A paper describes a structure:
The outer surface of the head is decorated with the highly antigenic outer capsid protein Hoc and the small outer capsid protein Soc. The Hoc subunits bind near the centers of gp23* capsomers, one per hexon, and have only a marginal effect on the capsid stability.
The atomic model consisting of the vertex-proximal gp23* hexamer and two C-terminal domains of Hoc corresponding to the preferred orientations was refined against the 3.3 Å-resolution cryo-EM reconstruction of the isometric T4 capsid (EMDB-8661) by adjusting the structure into the density using the Coot program, and refinement in the real space was carried out using the phenix.real_space_refine program. The refinement of the occupancies for the two Hoc orientations using the Phenix software resulted in occupancy values of 0.4 and 0.33 for the preferred orientations 1 and 2, respectively. The C-terminal domain of T4 Hoc contains a four-stranded β-sheet and a three-helix bundle on top of the β-sheet. The residues Arg300 and His299 of the Hoc C-terminal domain, which are located in the loop between β-strands 1 and 2, are involved in charge interactions with the Asp336 of the gp23* subunit A, thus reinforcing the Hoc attachment to the capsid. The Hoc molecule in the alternative preferred orientation 2 is rotated by 180° around the capsomer axis with respect to Hoc in orientation 1.
Numbering used by the authors:
A (entry chain A): 66 to 116
B (entry chain X): 281 to 376
C (entry chain B): 117 to 521
D (entry chain A): 269 to 521
E (entry chain C), G (entry chain D): 320 to 369
F (entry chain C): 117 to 167
């Protein structure tokens, strides 16, 4: 009566691939990476630059 | 010479205007029509009839006029800002 | 999700010489503007913080951290107190903004003196003058594929007479309703997750000083901007929805509100008013599919907001959300793994047919959902929605109840 | 000051550079801080608006709240009130020309709320209208510059607004006629190093700009003091004294 | 129920009640407020019958 | 009607293992939305009714 | 009868009564109220004469 089981829903358990069943999964796949966008600029038409 | 009974809370907001010791509230056309009708049969609008359909707004107007001596109340039929002295009589512009 | 239990990374650009630490403020925060004198005068010296009963002497600079729009550095233009009775963060921010409005506590930003800057971290025999450093954190979130299943278990004594007397099948009906119910339940689950995670709208920068802070009622003179009759009143809803779309843009940092999901009443109000910039108008609802029988998606708001209708609305509301062109910047992910794997069988004990459906989807939460926390917990965070990270915290969704319709 | 093992393993596992990421978030941070600094200098050195010649007699100085009938010229509902806001902007733009003598108001920088208000009004001369914010980029993700008002005012956005305001400014064709100068001297000079004890590399960025104030910005004095004045903004000479920028807090949006 | 204005009579639509006519005035704005009400229940049927 | 006393059938779609029962909720219903968690956690555990 | 606004004179139509002119303002709203009154009374002839 082999059971597939599942990770204990803990983030550490899924990250390590731990599974209460017989088979321990390789890893938690990949779904990309989210980086926070750089906030925008206001240009310099408001104030003269004059290098 | 009497004070208006308090109809619980939930009073409409009055915006304080320390620029001229005034304030501002948007009443509409029904409140002004009701006040004009009340001040035509010899009745009073500041405190009389504490169970009116829109007495809560009239009580708010009375409190606003007591707290601020130069209130600026805006109706909705014409959007005119009647002052405290103009609102004292209860007759706004026209009509019987 | 081709493979079960996917994961999503998230890079935090935080400063303070420690990529991971306690209370390290993120740099490129859409909510929190960067401390302008962090590389500047904030690196040469540490300014005294601004709090209750901090008598602001003339000419110096005080650091503060607002709950919204980040941290500020205020130059005291005149001596004044900060209303020592204000101890909570909200009241402290209110008092500081009051001082700002009066002009007593102005907001400035400057660089660093060249003498202090040219010698930093032990130069020319000096000491105790470190640089201001930065770094990236990179913490991950992990989701899990939850499952869902149903059974039919229809008798074989039934099908005979039911087909003989009604012409049905008793199998294409039960299987159809099972699959339809599973799909409907999954859809209702994701819709409730959108409403569950939606932030309380009309609270903060979208508030009018006199409004009710959470509901938009047409009977309030402040809420309708002193509107009259219906052409003027219903356009205040459009103005508020635009304000909350721009607030979503500020909080998320990805873009304006892309869609709204509303009740029948709010959608009907939207359709019955001229949404364009043209006087005040009203009439029968034409542009939007007000009913929820043909389809749910009911038109668009000037070609900007996709207006869906939530057919099971408790009291009333509209929820403005966000969904960028990419499938990643959504705010909540419904990632199916297996869809409706049908199973059949018949126990030899009774030979009565039995069938069932199984599916496994799992729901994930976009990192940077909170937009108010500069760092996650444990650096390996559960991606599934929960009390801690999803309830009333998704910056993407803002939900407002509309009253007085 | 990033580690070397961090670069070695992060390039292998994530595919980044571990140097262009840090250098990127350092140069971007410097530019963002400089931009916020010049914007804050503009706001802080801006004359308090709606005072003197632009003040309606029965109104507060420096505040334009939509709930004051005299403030909005006795407006009603929404279109009239926001059009009164537009009229106030025009009045301040002409006061800008009166004070500076260099030209009418040329740009405004406002909060998200004020820009959103401007985007939902028939800015031309025709009745009174409201609707969906159409003509302006109300949100600051794609860009901060949010359209133009009447083809005249380059309406920018102050995304990190504290409570609410709008500042009508000016900028002539010359970079000299500005009202305030962000005059860079060096621009993001990089610096590399490595402590020989541990060999872990350190990288940094150094800039030197300085901010100058335009003479005649006060424009209320026919002669300055000492014939040699400090050009950096300060409390004495750049606290609500520039005639090039006029700032008003808009309340009750 | 769903289509009721909170300050209304719950069963009638009289043009003399400003809450009922969305605070309208004269004739072009008061009658049009009925066109809203006739809409507010036309959708309501779609909620019930389906 | 050609013949008197006509009739019309109606097919409800109710869940709960019992097509007929005391208060068996109907699945497909315009007013009444489908229950949120019946095929999901509703089978793994039973939640307490709120009163 | 059926053409009587509950707040009118029942026999005359004066432009000065707000209920008679349905709350009209100035005269562009008021003469149109008179138009509505004559329209409403033209209908009742179809009710009575048939």
């Amino acid at each position: 009566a082999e059971i597939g089981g599942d990770h204990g829903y803990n983030a550490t358990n899924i990250a390590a691939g731990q599974t209460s069943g017989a088979v321990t999964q390789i890893g938690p796949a990949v779904m990309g990476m989210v980086r926070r966008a750089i906030p925008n600029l206001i240009a310099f038409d408001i104030c003269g630059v004059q290098p | 010479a009497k004070v208006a009974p308090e109809p619980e809370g939930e009073l409409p907001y009055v915006h304080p205007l320390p620029h001229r010791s005034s304030a501002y509230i948007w009443c509409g056309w029904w409140v002004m029509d009701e006040i004009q009708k009340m001040t035509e049969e010899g009745k009073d609008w500041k405190t009389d009839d504490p169970d009116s359909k829109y007495y809560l707004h009239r009580y708010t107007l009375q409190k606003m006029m007591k707290d601020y001596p130069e209130v600026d109340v805006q109706e909705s039929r014409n959007g005119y800002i009647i002052h405290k002295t103009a609102l004292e009589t209860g007759i706004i512009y026209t009509y019987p | 999700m081709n493979s079960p239990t996917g994961q999503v990374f998230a890079l935090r650009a935080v400063y303070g010489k420690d990529p991971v630490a306690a209370g390290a403020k993120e740099a490129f925060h859409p909510m929190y503007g960067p401390d302008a004198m962090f590389s500047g005068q904030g690196a040469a010296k540490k300014f005294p913080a601004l709090a209750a009963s901090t008598q602001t002497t003339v000419g110096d600079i005080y650091t503060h951290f607002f709950q919204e729009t980040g941290t500020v550095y205020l130059q005291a233009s005149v001596q004044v107190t900060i209303d020592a009775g204000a101890t909570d963060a909200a009241k402290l921010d209110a008092e500081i903004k009051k001082q700002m409005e009066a002009g007593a506590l102005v907001e400035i930003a400057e660089g660093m003196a060249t003498s202090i800057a040219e010698l930093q971290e032990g130069f020319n025999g000096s000491t105790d003058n470190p640089w201001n450093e930065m770094g990236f954190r990179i913490d991950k979130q992990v989701i899990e594929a939850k499952s869902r299943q149903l059974k039919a278990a229809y008798s074989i004594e039934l099908t005979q007479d039911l087909r003989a007397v009604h012409g049905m099948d008793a199998d294409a009906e039960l299987s159809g309703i099972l699959a339809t119910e599973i799909m409907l339940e999954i859809n209702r689950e994701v819709v409730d997750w959108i409403n569950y995670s939606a932030q309380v709208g009309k609270s903060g920068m979208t508030l009018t000083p006199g409004s009710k802070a959470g509901v938009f009622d047409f009977q309030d003179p402040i809420d309708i901007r002193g509107a009259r009759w219906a052409g003027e009143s219903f356009k205040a809803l459009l103005f508020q929805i635009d304000k909350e779309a721009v607030e979503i843009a500020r909080q998320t940092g990805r873009g304006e509100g892309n869609f709204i999901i509303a009740s029948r009443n709010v959608v009907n109000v939207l359709a019955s008013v001229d949404t364009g910039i043209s006087y005040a108008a009203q009439g029968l609802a034409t542009g939007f599919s007000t009913d929820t029988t043909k389809s749910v998606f009911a038109g668009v708001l000037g070609g900007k907001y996709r207006v869906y209708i939530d057919q099971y609305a408790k009291q009333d509301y509209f929820t403005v959300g966000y969904k960028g062109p990419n499938e990643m910047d959504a705010g909540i992910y419904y990632a199916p793994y297996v869809a409706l794997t049908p199973l059949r069988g018949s126990d030899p004990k009774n030979f009565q047919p039995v069938m069932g459906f199984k599916t496994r989807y799992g729901i994930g939460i976009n990192p940077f959902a909170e937009s108010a926390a500069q760092a996650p917990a444990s650096r390996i965070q559960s991606g599934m929605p929960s009390i801690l990270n999803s309830l009333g915290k998704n910056a993407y969704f803002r939900r407002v109840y509309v009253k007085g319709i």
